[PDB]
């Protein structure tokens, strides 16, 4: 039953993802708890964000054909397209990444099997842009 509602909310999440971006066809993977950090170069250390929640990797019916979002447990989400300017570095249970703006990030995973699996998935769908 806990998983019935689980399946349910993954159905509703897809749909919510779609109302904000309709090129979206399906969720490729999701995780339990993840939390977002950003790197501050000036101060030279990591800094917490207000972002913490569930991570969804989804496919799109148009380039960029992949994206990922952290739906926050306030209402400010992380949204990130999977293009070739995205680069990753895995340091379990953290997943570091840089994007087009050159801003630096770390996704901490609670479950380190999620960390490995998503890291692998990303690497696959970065090789495909």
């Amino acid at each position: 039953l806990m998983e019935a509602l689980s399946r349910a909310g993954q159905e509703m999440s897809l749909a919510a993802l779609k109302q904000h971006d309709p090129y979206i066809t399906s969720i490729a993977d999701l995780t339990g708890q993840v939390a977002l950090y950003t790197f501050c170069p000036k101060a030279n250390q990591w800094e917490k964000t207000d972002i913490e929640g569930t991570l969804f990797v989804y496919r799109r019916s148009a380039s960029p054909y992949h994206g990922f979002t952290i739906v926050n447990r306030n209402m400010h989400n992380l949204v990130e397209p999977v293009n070739k300017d995205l680069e990753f570095q895995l340091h379990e249970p953290f997943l570091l990444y840089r994007n087009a703006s050159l801003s630096i990030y770390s996704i901490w995973f609670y479950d380190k099997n999620d960390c490995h699996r998503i890291a692998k998935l990303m690497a696959d769908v970065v090789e495909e842009e």
Binding site: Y37, N44, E47, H91, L96, I104
Partner: peptide, 14 residues
């Protein structure tokens, strides 16, 4: 959720 004491990013990213 770890204190902001994660590992450093690849040197070349900075």
């Amino acid at each position: 959720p770890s204190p902001s004491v994660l590992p450093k990013p690849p040197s070349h990213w900075v």
